[PDB]
Amino acid sequence: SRIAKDVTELIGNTPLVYLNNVAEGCVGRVAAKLEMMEPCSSVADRIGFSMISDAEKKGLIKPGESVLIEPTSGNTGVGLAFTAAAKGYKLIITMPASMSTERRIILLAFGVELVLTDPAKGMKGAIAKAEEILAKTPNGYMLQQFENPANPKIHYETTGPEIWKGTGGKIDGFVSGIGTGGTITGAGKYLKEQNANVKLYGVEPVESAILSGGKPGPHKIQGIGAGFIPSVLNVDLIDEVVQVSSDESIDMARQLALKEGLLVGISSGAAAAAAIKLAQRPENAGKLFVAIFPSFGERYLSTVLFDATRKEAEAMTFEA
Ligand SMILES: CSCC[C@H](/N=C/c1c(COP(=O)(O)O)cnc(C)c1O)C(=O)O
Description:
It is classed as transferase. Keywords: transferase. It forms a monomeric assembly. The chain is of the alpha/beta class. The chain is built from nine helices and ten strands. It has two domains: 1-37 and 159-309, 3-Layer(aba) Sandwich (Rossmann fold); 38-145, Rossmann fold. A six-stranded mixed sheet has the order 1-2-10-7-8-9, sandwiched between helices. A four-stranded parallel sheet has the order 5-4-3-6, with helices on both faces.
């Protein structure tokens, strides 16, 4: 046992816990890959560092000399934020003035030069500014979590293995929600390379199931269902696409807290419902599914996920 040179040696090597009370009635088992345990409690912590580490080894960027830029409103902002933090990188994350003031604090806290755009233009208003700021900045650098290959690479070298070596090769199916598609692909390719019978089940919002023939729509399952095929996503690897609604996802994310003591984000719930539904198909008795729980639930107190219990809060008045 030794001391890590810095916060970045702490990335990866996340734990595997079974689902007990929620998997009621399954003939199969479901192990949860807890990315919430990542240093900044998110799976993005892998692509954040990965993409930087990579552009570094390639010699395309150098601390303070280069100026990382990146369009995103989700966790990769944080995964990048703390990696740029320890490695001394000026960072600029573009996102509409819409995203909570908290997701703004967290990056500010990391010295992230967050730049807000028109909260009506959505992602385009962000990427515009993003791209803009790039063409504008001499030594600016666009990471592009959806295009960059370091993304699935990292998953091919760690998440992939971690899962394999975790289940000791007995893994029967890999369940993952598709955001940039990096995880499912990267880690996915590596398992298939260790066993072709391994099944990669893709998960996406029922309300925005594009890989199911459906049309992109808005949903609450924050973190996946980008409404399109990220270049890094290699759909051919997917053996099946399970769809889940923002509602099951939510509910499931809640049962997870009250029955497993796993406080997780709504994307994790969805990945879990998916995994349990599969575990219940008769023909899968005895099989092992590994579902990725992408984030911790504390970074969602200000979201649809907590509105319910949130009233139970402010409302309830003190007792004497
Ligand atoms: C729009 S999409 C988004 C993406 C990223 N993340 C990441 C994530 C995911 C995805 O994962 P992938 O591999 O598919 O990418 C999920 N969930 C969660 C919670 C998270 O954060 C960011 O944020 O940037």
